[PDB]
Design a protein around this ligand. Structure first.
Ligand SMILES: *[C@@H]1O[C@H](CO)[C@@H](O[C@@H]2O[C@H](CO)[C@@H](O[C@@H]3O[C@H](CO)[C@@H](O[C@@H]4O[C@H](CO)[C@@H](O)[C@H](O)[C@@H]4O)[C@H](O)[C@@H]3O)[C@H](O)[C@H]2NC(C)=O)[C@H](O)[C@H]1NC(C)=O
Ligand SMILES: *[C@@H]1O[C@H](CO)[C@@H](O[C@@H]2O[C@H](CO)[C@@H](O[C@@H]3O[C@H](CO)[C@@H](O)[C@H](O)[C@@H]3O)[C@H](O)[C@H]2NC(C)=O)[C@H](O)[C@H]1NC(C)=O
Ligand SMILES: *[C@@H]1O[C@H](CO)[C@@H](O[C@@H]2O[C@H](CO)[C@@H](O)[C@H](O)[C@H]2NC(C)=O)[C@H](O)[C@H]1NC(C)=O
Ligand SMILES: CC(=O)N[C@@H]1[C@@H](O)[C@H](O)[C@@H](CO)O[C@H]1O
Ligand SMILES: [Fe+3]
Ligand SMILES: [Zn+2]
Ligand SMILES: [Zn+2]
Length: 340
């Protein structure tokens, strides 16, 4: 009744949730699935209450009646006077990254190169990039643009999974969850750092968070920003400090979604939950922090300051914005539970 059932995607996320459930005294319990879409089915079924989602999945859920409840908010310099829970969300920059040593690689010479995506159906890792590529290309054969890629979610036998690696033993190749070495923002970036792929479709924050000694992770401790470049849409190549003038798009922050007849309940518990394990919670540092997972973005991106109220009690289309919504629609033209 006053308890929330969260849906975790994959084994690593289920571990962090179990910990969260334990520290909350059952105020929050977990449900597990192997993929985000399965997590959405559980929520529709009623066996799970909520889960945080990238804009790409919100589109999907939205059609199935789910609704955004709260959104993640990272630290910004403008809009200082206002608290985090009430402050407007700015969204993030989807960028295309490359190794600087890869001279001559530009947005115009990407065909047949090797791409690293966060996962199919995600904003910065799939929808924005393949969206632009389907339009400029005029074709729907985005499955043939790149020679080889790693796009968690696609057919394991296809070229779109050729570069993925699976887990420690090579099992779960290409599964859209943290078990895949190259899954998500971090996964896709590693995919480039290790020179597996030629280009990685992530977000501006990912580069910074994993370069210049910010990650301490063995595959990223020796990473230096200067050795990276962004691919702008005009054919130019700018430093990672010029993200504001060289990005593919601004994307809507990830957000917690739930069934509408529960949104109120999910919100109440969450706000309270975050006042205890949030950025400045009564018990985050000492006992448990909802927004930490040592660079893996488990349940929430590690750069989340807090979960913000929406205000305007927005529908999923409104939340995602008309801009992004068409982009997705146009792309989906090329391809219950896809509830319309
Ligand atoms: C692209 O993405 C990057 C990464 O998110 C953005 O860079 C961050 O931007 C913020 C806001 O402009 C900037 O403000 C400072 O935040 C610091 C915390 O990161 C604060 O102090 C510093 O904290 C560091 C982290 O603990 C610490 O290592 C350092 O010693 C110092 O204490 C500071 O008070 C400011 O608020 C961040 O510094 C910056 N973070 C990083 C890692 O660079 C960047 O703005 C994005 N670009 C665009 C176009 O949006
Ligand atoms: C890929 O190409 C498609 C096809 O053009 C792009 O869709 C088009 O997107 C623009 C801008 O979002 C739409 O224009 C808007 O039209 C509405 C009224 O329909 C108007 O009120 C706005 O001021 C604006 O002019 C356009 O309608 C839409 N075309 C169709 C038929 O869907 C799509 O955005 C491109 N995708 C990417 C990732 O760039
Ligand atoms: C777990 O959730 C319960 C329910 O909200 C919390 O207990 C409540 O504490 C507030 C503040 O004292 C009271 O207004 C409620 O009446 C209490 N619930 C009841 C009916 O006993 C509890 O604080 C939460 N603990 C954790 C770890 O999150
Ligand atoms: C114009 C713009 O910045 N795009 C916004 C994005 O920042 C925001 O996160 C999202 C959710 O409302 O809606 C988009 O339209
Ligand atoms: Fe995203
Ligand atoms: Zn822009
Ligand atoms: Zn409205």
């Amino acid at each position: 009744y006053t308890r929330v059932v969260w849906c975790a995607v994959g084994p690593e996320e289920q571990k962090k949730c179990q910990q969260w459930s334990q520290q909350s005294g059952q105020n929050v319990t977990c449900a597990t699935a192997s993929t985000t879409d399965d997590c959405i089915v559980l929520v529709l079924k009623g066996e799970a209450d909520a889960l945080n989602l990238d804009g790409g999945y919100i589109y999907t859920a939205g059609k199935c009646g789910l609704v955004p409840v709260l959104a993640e908010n990272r630290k910004s310099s403008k809009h200082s006077s206002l608290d985090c829970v009430l402050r407007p969300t700015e969204g993030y920059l989807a960028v295309a990254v490359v190794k600087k040593a890869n001279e001559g690689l530009t947005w115009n010479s990407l065909k047949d190169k090797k791409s690293c995506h966060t996962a199919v159906d995600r904003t910065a890792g799939w929808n924005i990039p393949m969206g632009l590529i389907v339009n400029q290309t005029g074709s729907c054969a985005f499955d043939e643009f790149f020679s080889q890629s790693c796009a968690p979610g696609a057919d394991p036998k296809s070229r779109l999974c050729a570069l993925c690696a699976g887990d420690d033993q090579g099992l779960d190749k290409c599964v859209p969850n943290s078990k895949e070495k190259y899954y998500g923002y971090t996964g896709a970036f590693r995919c480039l750092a290790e020179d597996v792929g030629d280009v990685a479709f992530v977000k501006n924050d990912t580069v910074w968070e994993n370069t210049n000694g910010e990650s301490t992770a063995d595959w990223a401790k020796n990473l230096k920003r200067e050795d990276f470049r962004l691919l702008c849409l005009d054919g130019t190549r700018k430093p990672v400090t010029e993200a504001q003038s060289c990005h593919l798009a601004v994307a809507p922050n990830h957000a917690v979604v739930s069934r509408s007849d529960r949104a109120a309940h999910v919100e109440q518990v969450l706000l309270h939950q975050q006042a205890l394990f949030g950025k400045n919670g009564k018990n985050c540092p000492d006992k448990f922090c909802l927004f930490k997972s040592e660079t893996k973005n488990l349940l929430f991106n590690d750069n989340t300051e807090c979960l913000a109220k929406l205000g305007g009690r927005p529908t999923y289309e409104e939340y995602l914005g008309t801009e992004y919504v068409t982009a997705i629609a146009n792309l989906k033209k090329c391809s219950l539970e896809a509830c319309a």
